[PDB]
Design a protein around this ligand. Structure first.
Ligand SMILES: *[C@@H]1O[C@H](CO)[C@@H](O)[C@H](O)[C@H]1NC(C)=O
Ligand SMILES: *[C@@H]1O[C@H](CO)[C@@H](O)[C@H](O)[C@H]1NC(C)=O
Ligand SMILES: *[C@@H]1O[C@H](CO)[C@@H](O)[C@H](O)[C@H]1NC(C)=O
Ligand SMILES: *[C@@H]1O[C@H](CO)[C@@H](O)[C@H](O)[C@H]1NC(C)=O
Ligand SMILES: *[C@@H]1O[C@H](CO)[C@@H](O)[C@H](O)[C@H]1NC(C)=O
Ligand SMILES: *[C@@H]1O[C@H](CO)[C@@H](O)[C@H](O)[C@H]1NC(C)=O
Ligand SMILES: *[C@@H]1O[C@H](CO)[C@@H](O)[C@H](O)[C@H]1NC(C)=O
Ligand SMILES: *[C@@H]1O[C@H](CO)[C@@H](O)[C@H](O)[C@H]1NC(C)=O
Ligand SMILES: *[C@@H]1O[C@H](CO)[C@@H](O)[C@H](O)[C@H]1NC(C)=O
Ligand SMILES: *[C@@H]1O[C@H](CO)[C@@H](O)[C@H](O)[C@H]1NC(C)=O
Ligand SMILES: *[C@@H]1O[C@H](CO)[C@@H](O)[C@H](O)[C@H]1NC(C)=O
Lengths: 49, 50, 100, 367, 50
């Protein structure tokens, strides 16, 4: 070990505000409004109405 | 360290003060309460001519 | 396994850290590991150490799962038999003395 | 024995409200002679409390339904002759998954996290005594614990209740915490009104997933049940102001969400407010729903194809490719690779399932 | 003077104060909590000094 090959993959991320192309496996719930809730829009979280 | 008249709970070991300071500690070997006082005395003023 | 010891730490990801053992984010203590190829490897292969491979969701810190129910990895529901697209959730380590 | 009960007049609970009961000790830091604000899962003041009965008049009434266990519960029981004797905690309440059983017999309390097969109608009985008619077998077992009892002998008869027993159950970090307080009351047919603080009792390390629970009752056995009642409440995330005395015991508390007066008290960090007009803040409209909105991409990223290549690259001529329009699921490689190195810099590895990226690049080489 | 003081107090909310981002939302979105405490503490110190 030390003279044996290692396969290296490095991923570079780019958040930006353009439409998302790669996403996590999270499931999407139905949308509600007029109510103080916790939301998650394309990875952007927050709390409000 | 000095001798203290404070009474601890049977399972207590430390005593905390208002400003999150240790007041009295129970000796692990001889189960007696010893109060802790800083050895620095504030309020010393030096009067001197020039 | 030798390559999964890094997953025994607060805030790690992987099958070990997601399916069978998780540490709290405010953990206070020490983690100790050492190579045990001397007395945990058998010439024909030691297959008495098992790990979980499939679970519906990640487990909470210091939580244990013991259940051995068949895992539904496909659209169609399955039964006690494995069949197609449904697997036994527990898999056994393969430990040989000549392993790297 | 696995025997159903006959002659019960259905399960129909009544409702009431708990004025100021259910305050316990958050965390474990020692505090004395101070006022602190703490955020935790408390039982809010004047919250609706489910009420169940256990009496015979000659129609029997035994209330042992299956209730939900979400973020912990508050359990209280006005009692005479000790009909209530234990609880069942678990998620499926059968042989599939482990369950927690808390049972007090005539001399000791028995706690064991085990894999039970509970029957349809679990209950204890006593003649003399004849009990343990709640399960059939447990087989593989993990935990066991025996200590001093909490409840008294099932025999006896009176006209009014004598004791009130309050419990708080929580499940955090693989620990089953129990808080209790025992007080004598002379009430007739209701939960007492007042303030109660519950001291820590046990810290059992269980490490099981608990979602559902039910109560164990004692019948006399052609069977009769003595008069008893128990009450169920649910904890919710609130902010409380607590006062500690020199013993390190809570003596008073205010719920900062109850009304504007409690809001002013919590804002000013004092149990009494002078005459005037005070600016309050955060009128405690705490959210209770969490929503997620993600795009319509459903196909999975070809991580297996990328990692399965016959040859990757030379390090001096590393190959770069773009990944787009897929779902990043690292769990599909768990049976193949077992990454010996996985370090992330701009993000935390546990937040990858919650994030969406505009574009991703992948560089491959062998060193 | 009073209006300018209030406006400056509002506009100071976009300062990073040495954190990765001045937006509180995209720190808890990207960083796990015990790593996020450092950024949150820097932001708290700056906004409390203002
Ligand atoms: C601890 O041991 C010392 C030395 O034998 C003895 O003097 C002391 O009384 C002991 N204390 C306790 C609490 O046993
Ligand atoms: C606990 O069990 C319920 C039963 O459906 C399940 O939905 C939940 O994901 C489990 N929790 C964990 C942390 O595995
Ligand atoms: C009790 O009744 C239920 C249905 O009411 C039945 O499924 C169950 O088998 C009965 N108990 C026993 C021990 O047979
Ligand atoms: C709480 O319960 C007591 C006792 O029944 C009752 O008098 C009181 O009105 C209840 N609280 C409210 C806000 O109704
Ligand atoms: C209390 O809450 C329960 C929850 O279902 C509800 O059934 C009951 O009507 C409520 N009572 C009052 C007085 O709001
Ligand atoms: C639990 O009980 C059921 C019914 O008696 C049985 O089929 C099952 O095998 C039991 N589980 C175990 C682990 O023995
Ligand atoms: C109560 O349970 C304990 C188990 O530790 C046992 O030793 C004792 O004999 C039991 N007593 C009765 C009256 O069932
Ligand atoms: C379950 O029981 C079987 C047979 O008693 C035993 O071989 C196995 O090791 C047990 N598993 C656990 C997780 O206790
Ligand atoms: C609690 O403090 C009181 C004094 O306010 C004291 O009388 C009492 O003994 C203390 N509790 C215990 C258990 O000693
Ligand atoms: C690579 O792909 C081939 C065919 O698609 C498959 O048989 C093989 O198992 C894959 N390799 C790995 C390590 O999964
Ligand atoms: C995981 O890989 C091993 C390789 O020997 C294979 O035997 C097993 O069937 C695989 N599991 C699944 C669920 O494909």
């Amino acid at each position: 070990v030390g003279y044996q090959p290692y396969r290296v993959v490095v991923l570079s991320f780019e958040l930006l505000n353009a439409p998302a192309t790669v996403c996590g496996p999270k499931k999407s719930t139905n949308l509600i409004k007029n109510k103080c809730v916790n939301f998650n829009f394309n990875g952007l979280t927050g709390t409000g109405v | 360290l000095t001798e203290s008249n404070k009474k601890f709970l049977p399972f207590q070991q430390f005593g905390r003060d208002i400003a999150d300071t240790t007041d009295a500690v129970r000796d692990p070997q001889t189960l007696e309460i010893l109060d802790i006082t800083p050895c620095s005395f504030g309020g010393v003023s030096v009067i001197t001519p020039g | 396994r030798g390559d999964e010891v890094r997953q025994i730490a607060p805030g790690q990801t992987g099958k070990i850290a997601d399916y069978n053992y998780k540490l709290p984010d405010d953990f206070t203590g020490c983690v100790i590991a050492w190579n045990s190829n001397n007395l945990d490897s058998k010439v024909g292969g030691n297959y008495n150490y098992l790990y979980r491979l499939f679970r519906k969701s990640n487990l909470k810190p210091f939580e244990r799962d013991i259940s051995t129910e068949i895992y539904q990895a496909g659209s169609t529901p399955c039964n006690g038999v494995e069949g197609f697209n449904c697997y036994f959730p527990l898999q056994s380590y393969g430990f040989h003395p000549t392993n790297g | 024995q696995c025997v159903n009960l006959t002659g019960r007049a259905t399960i129909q609970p009544s409702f009431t409200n708990s004025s100021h009961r259910g305050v316990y000790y958050p965390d474990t830091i020692f505090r004395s002679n101070s006022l602190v604000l703490s955020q935790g899962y408390f039982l809010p003041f004047y919250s609706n409390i489910s009420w169940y009965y256990a009496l015979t008049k000659a129609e029997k009434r035994v209330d042992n339904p299956i209730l939900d266990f979400k973020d912990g519960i508050y359990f209280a029981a006005t009692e005479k002759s000790n009909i209530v004797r234990g609880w069942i905690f678990g998620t499926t309440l059968d042989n599939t998954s482990q369950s927690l059983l808390i049972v007090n017999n005539a001399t000791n309390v028995i706690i064991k996290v085990c894999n039970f097969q509970f029957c349809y109608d679990p209950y204890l009985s006593g003649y003399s005594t004849r009990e343990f008619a709640v399960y059939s077998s447990y087989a593989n077992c993990t935990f066991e614990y025996v200590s001093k009892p909490f409840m008294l002998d099932i025999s006896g008869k009176s006209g009014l209740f004598d004791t009130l027993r309050e419990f708080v159950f929580r499940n955090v970090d693989g620990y089953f915490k129990i808080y209790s307080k025992y007080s004598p009351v002379n009430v007739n047919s209701n939960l007492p009104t007042g303030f109660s603080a519950l001291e820590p009792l046990v810290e059992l390390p269980a490490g099981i997933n608990i979602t559902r629970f039910r109560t164990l009752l004692t019948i006399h056995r052609g069977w009769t049940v003595f008069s008893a009642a128990y009450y169920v409440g649910y904890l919710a995330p609130r902010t409380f102001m607590l006062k500690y005395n020199e013993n390190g015991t809570i003596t008073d508390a205010v719920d900062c969400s109850l009304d504007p007066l409690s809001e002013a008290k919590c804002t000013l960090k004092s149990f009494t407010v002078e005459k005037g007009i005070y600016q309050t803040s955060n009128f405690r409209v705490q959210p209770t729903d969490s929503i997620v909105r993600f795009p319509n991409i459903t196909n999975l990223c070809p991580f297996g194809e990328v990692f399965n290549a016959t040859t990757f690259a030379s390090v001096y001529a590393w190959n770069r490719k773009r990944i787009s329009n897929c779902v990043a699921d690292y769990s599909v490689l768990y049976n193949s690779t077992s990454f010996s190195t996985f370090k992330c810099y701009g993000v935390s590895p546990t937040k990858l399932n919650d994030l969406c990226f505009t574009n991703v690049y992948a560089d491959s080489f062998v060193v | 003077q009073n209006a300018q003081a209030l406006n400056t107090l509002v506009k100071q909310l976009s300062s990073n104060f040495g954190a990765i981002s001045s937006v509180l939302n995209d720190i808890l979105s990207r960083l796990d909590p015990p790593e996020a405490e450092v950024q949150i503490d820097r932001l708290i110190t700056g906004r409390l000094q203002s």
